[PDB]
Write a protein that binds this DNA or RNA. Structure first.
Ligand SMILES: Nc1nc2c(ncn2[C@@H]2O[C@H](COP(=O)(O)OP(=O)(O)OP(=O)(O)O)[C@@H](O)[C@H]2O)c(=O)[nH]1
Ligand SMILES: [Mg+2]
Ligand SMILES: [Zn+2]
Ligand SMILES: [Zn+2]
Ligand SMILES: [Zn+2]
Lengths: 166, 86, 50, 98, 76, 49, 97, 55, 39, 99, 122
RNA sequence: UGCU
């Protein structure tokens, strides 16, 4: 979770003038940045606040009200060392499929650092004994439109001991 | 009259003449080795200025351990005009 | 014009802004005078002066 | 999950910068190479030849035969250019004084 | 504050057109029209009543700008 | 300034009418000029060979 | 088209354009000569300034800087003819603000 | 077929010099507008025969 | 220029397009910012 | 007849007509008479709003045949035009949404 | 649609919880049918993030407590990331600071752990 | 080729 500065030219139709301009801008920004991953920024959750809001222009075209609004929004973007607590939403032979609680099923922990008893035989077996912890390692983003996903990140689980659950 | 061609010519047409092989000799080998050594040693030279990294994520205690350290040459300000002093 | 077979053109704008601009700027009641010397062109004619 | 990409922007042209293209830029812009001098095929359908003039990969000019590059009709097709190489260079009459 | 206080015919036309477009796009009316099915007539009524929520942004050639309200300007 | 490649435009600029009433079609002058240019290039290549 | 037999429309000649300019009805002139006559939406790449198709620029082999733009079909034809003549018009787009 | 109701009653009916293929059940306009040439344009397309264009 | 404006299909700078219009919407410039507790 | 003078500076448009003129002093200086035949052909796109909803309903019910009416309707959700000469004009009028 | 700074300022989970609660109450107070039908992903993401933060121990927090914890940790020369992780996790056991928390070498001292536990529990 |  981190704040990100953005400047958006929001277009409000004429039938929304009876509503408050700031409230309409906030609703539009939320609808536009709800469940979407901005490249090199992360997945934006919602709008935090609006800092600067200059004059509202009206173009001779569509006739709507275009406003250039500067705002701050919250995005989920770890700092390469953040610790999280997720749940195992499945498991694959090459690696478990852990997912943060109802947030995003994109965490793919590689099983290449645990003690030397690591293997998945497709029976949803997590690990042979001697709320799942996760340590973010690196981020990565990719594009989608390439002809006429985008966030997976690397997860780590060192020898944390875990006296509560093996 | 000239015949019509259905497909376009090849992007890389073949040639019956091949390049002459390179000259062989201890001199050429030593020159190659010296050029490779220069390529390897000139990148680490202080004159090889790298792109200044920016937009650091956070500050950590391991910053002092991972801090890149390299001696910097001092230009001759007597010969160089004053418009290049930091 | 002289009403001796002249064919004139009639256009219908397809936008409210264009309609308003045509009615305001190109209004007959507002263009009763020419910008050349300000003399009124829309006035009485034959069969009315007499 | 989903990436953020803007759908449409109210882009306004600022100014037109005229210029010229080198042969490499012309090749990069063009899609195919026109080398056949004929227009239609020998069959009675008179279909346009491939890699030749009037090819449908460089746009469309008929309401029945759509474009081959983009799967759109004539009303929606913008057209595509082609590059034809010359054996010997030639002076550009427009730029001859230049 | 240095320009002419009178509202020119071009400004009149542009404001009326913009208001007519907004009304045709289901914008709220602030004059309580009485059987006026014409957006341009509604815009003219709003102009005569001095209730059009539009502010003219007059730009000078150098780059400066100045705001003038419809109710603040003078109409003919 | 010295051209070695000619940019043949799309077919939108070269409209072609399929005149089914006869064994021919109506083509613009640019198409004929490009055809003549290609024929001359082929003839020059043949003479060089 | 031109003729009435072929269902042709009227022509707003140069004199009509001059009259509209003198009147100053900018929106009227625009709706006449652009919207109601040869309105079309093209795709222009903000990197090279060339014309794309279906939101794709074949020159740069990318689609991130391609954006839609309203332009007269006659102006698009003129740009294409100039590009064929090797006079490449490089369009540098920008926000309307 | 009609994109709205799925009917196949598509009739080509020109409405005041406007060719339009419209459905006869719901009146949904399927396609409209046709690109023809114009006389000067016709004049300038030159006649070339298949004996030369085909090869 | 008016000629290139007409050619490109944009409102010419002369006439009604010399100035710009603004909407008199009920708003509040520089709204109150939410205070940051952690920073 | 070039692209600059023949297709850019002066070009042909639609929604326009050409007709012979005749005198009629019974009309105001700012008024002009238009024949029913040209009026039924030259149409104007009106947006359905909270003011002229009933007028547009009545025009659609009249249809393209009667002079006061319309010819086509473009929905707000889908841009597929609908010809009033076919279909139930009463239903089309009863299902007129804003926009 | 460009961004100016993706790492302007880090914030704990309490701020996100408060923002989500405010958005949820404003939504249930001024719900709009067409606005909700246009984009339903907003509702889903808000509800699920709120449910996750509720599952977490982030409850029973206040800005006064946050400021007190920050002022108490300022005297431990700990880094912003460490204090952020500690405030977001609220560790009740010692192992969570001994091993899970990074940069343990030379920072534990085997005496400051008791003070850290007391401060995070108070 | 006619029309204004
Ligand atoms: N009905 C009609 N006949 C024409 C027209 N134009 C040309 N003609 C015939 O052609 C002769 C003169 O036409 P020209 O002006 O020489 O034709 P042109 O010079 O090509 O005219 P442009 O096509 O405008 O260049 C007349 O004496 C007519 O015989 C026309 O526009 N309408
Ligand atoms: Mg006469
Ligand atoms: Zn194409
Ligand atoms: Zn490009
Ligand atoms: Zn149907």
């Amino acid at each position: 979770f981190v704040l990100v500065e953005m400047v958006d030219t929001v277009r409000i139709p004429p039938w929304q003038f009876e509503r408050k301009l700031n409230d309409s801008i906030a609703e539009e920004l939320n609808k536009k940045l709800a469940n979407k991953v901005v490249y090199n920024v992360g997945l934006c959750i919602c709008l935090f606040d609006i800092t600067k809001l200059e004059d509202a222009y009206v173009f001779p075209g569509d006739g709507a009200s275009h406003t250039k609004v500067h705002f701050r929004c919250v995005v989920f973007h770890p700092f390469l060392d953040e610790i999280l607590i997720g749940k195992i939403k499945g498991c694959s032979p090459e690696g478990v499929h852990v997912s943060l609680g109802f947030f995003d099923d994109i965490l793919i922990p590689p099983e290449s650092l645990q003690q030397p008893a690591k293997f998945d035989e497709a029976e949803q077996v997590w690990v042979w004994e001697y709320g799942e912890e996760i340590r973010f390692r690196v981020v990565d983003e990719s594009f989608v439109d390439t002809s006429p996903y985008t966030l997976v990140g690397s997860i780590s689980e060192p020898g944390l001991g875990l006296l509560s659950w093996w | 009259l000239p015949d019509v061609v259905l497909k376009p010519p090849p992007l890389f047409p073949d040639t019956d003449y091949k390049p002459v092989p390179l000259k062989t000799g201890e001199g050429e080998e030593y020159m190659l080795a010296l050029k490779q050594e220069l390529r390897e040693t000139m990148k680490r030279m202080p004159y090889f200025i790298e792109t200044p990294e920016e937009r650091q994520d956070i500050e950590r205690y391991s910053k002092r351990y991972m801090k890149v350290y390299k001696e910097e040459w001092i230009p001759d300000w007597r010969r160089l005009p004053r418009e290049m002093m930091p | 014009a002289d009403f001796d077979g002249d064919e004139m053109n009639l256009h219908l704008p397809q936008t409210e802004e264009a309609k308003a601009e045509a009615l305001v700027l190109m209004g007959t009641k507002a263009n009763l005078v020419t910008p050349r010397n300000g003399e009124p062109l829309i006035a009485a004619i034959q069969d009315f002066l007499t | 999950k989903e990436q953020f990409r803007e759908t449409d922007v109210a882009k306004k042209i600022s100014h037109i910068c005229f210029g010229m293209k080198s042969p490499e830029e012309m090749r990069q812009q063009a899609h195919i190479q026109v080398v056949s001098k004929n227009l239609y095929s020998q069959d009675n359908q008179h279909a346009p030849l491939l890699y030749g003039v009037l090819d449908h990969r460089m746009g469309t000019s008929e309401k029945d035969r759509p474009c081959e590059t983009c799967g759109k009709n004539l009303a929606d097709c913008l057209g595509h250019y082609g590059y034809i190489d010359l054996e010997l260079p030639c002076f550009h009459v427009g730029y001859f004084r230049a | 504050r240095i320009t002419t206080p009178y509202m020119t015919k071009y400004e009149r036309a542009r404001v009326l057109g913009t208001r007519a477009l907004q009304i045709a796009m289901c914008a709220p009316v602030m004059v309580e029209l009485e059987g006026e099915t014409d957006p341009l007539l509604i815009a003219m009524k709003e102009l005569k009543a001095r209730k059009i929520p539009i502010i003219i942004r007059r730009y000078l050639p150098d780059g400066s700008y100045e705001d003038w309200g419809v109710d603040e300007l003078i109409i003919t | 300034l010295i051209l070695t490649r000619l940019l043949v435009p799309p077919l939108c600029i070269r409209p072609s009418v399929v005149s089914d009433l006869k064994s021919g079609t109506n083509e613009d002058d640019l198409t004929m000029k490009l055809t003549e240019i290609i024929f001359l290039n082929d003839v020059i290549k043949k003479h060089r060979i | 088209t031109e003729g009435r037999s072929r269902d042709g429309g009227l022509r707003l000649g140069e004199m009509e354009r001059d009259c509209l300019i003198g009147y100053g009805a900018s929106m009227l002139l625009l709706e006449r000569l652009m919207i109601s006559s040869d309105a079309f939406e093209v795709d222009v790449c903000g990197q090279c300034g060339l014309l794309g198709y279906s939101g794709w620029c074949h020159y740069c082999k990318s689609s991130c800087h391609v954006s839609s733009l309203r332009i007269p079909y006659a102006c698009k034809l003129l740009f294409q003819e100039l590009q064929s003549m090797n006079i490449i018009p490089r369009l540098k787009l920008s926000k309307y603000n | 077929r009609c994109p709205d109701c799925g009917s196949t009653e598509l009739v080509e009916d020109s409405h005041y010099s406007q060719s339009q293929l419209v459905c006869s059940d719901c009146g949904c306009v399927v396609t409209e507008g046709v690109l023809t040439t114009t006389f000067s344009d016709e004049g300038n397309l030159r006649e070339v025969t298949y004996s030369r264009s085909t090869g | 220029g008016v000629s290139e404006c007409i050619i490109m299909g944009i409102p010419m700078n002369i006439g009604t397009g010399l100035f710009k219009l603004l909407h008199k919407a009920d708003r509040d410039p520089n709204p109150p910012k939410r205070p940051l507790i952690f920073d | 007849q070039g692209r600059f003078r023949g297709n850019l500076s002066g070009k042909r448009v639609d929604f326009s007509g050409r007709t012979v003129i005749s005198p009629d002093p019974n009309l105001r200086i700012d008024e002009v008479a238009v024949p029913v035949h040209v009026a039924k052909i030259l149409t104007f796109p009106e947006k359905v709003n909270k003011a002229n909803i009933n007028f547009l309903r009545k025009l659609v019910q009249n249809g393209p045949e009667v002079h006061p009416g319309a010819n086509f309707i473009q929905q707000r959700h889908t841009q597929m035009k609908r010809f009033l000469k076919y279909g139930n004009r009463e239903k089309m009028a009863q299902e007129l949404k804003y926009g | 649609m460009e961004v100016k700074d993706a790492n302007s300022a880090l914030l704990s989970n309490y701020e996100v919880f408060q923002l989500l609660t405010d958005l949820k109450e404003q939504r249930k107070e001024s719900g709009k049918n067409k606005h909700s039908s246009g984009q339903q992903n907003l509702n889903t993401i808000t509800y699920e993030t709120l449910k996750y933060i509720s599952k977490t121990p982030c409850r029973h927090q206040s800005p006064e407590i946050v400021r007190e914890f920050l002022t108490a940790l300022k005297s431990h020369k700990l880094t912003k990331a460490e204090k952020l992780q500690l405030l977001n996790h609220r560790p009740v056991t010692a192992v969570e600071i001994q091993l899970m928390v990074e940069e343990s070498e030379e920072r534990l001292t085997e005496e400051q752990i008791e003070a850290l536990l007391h401060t995070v529990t108070s």
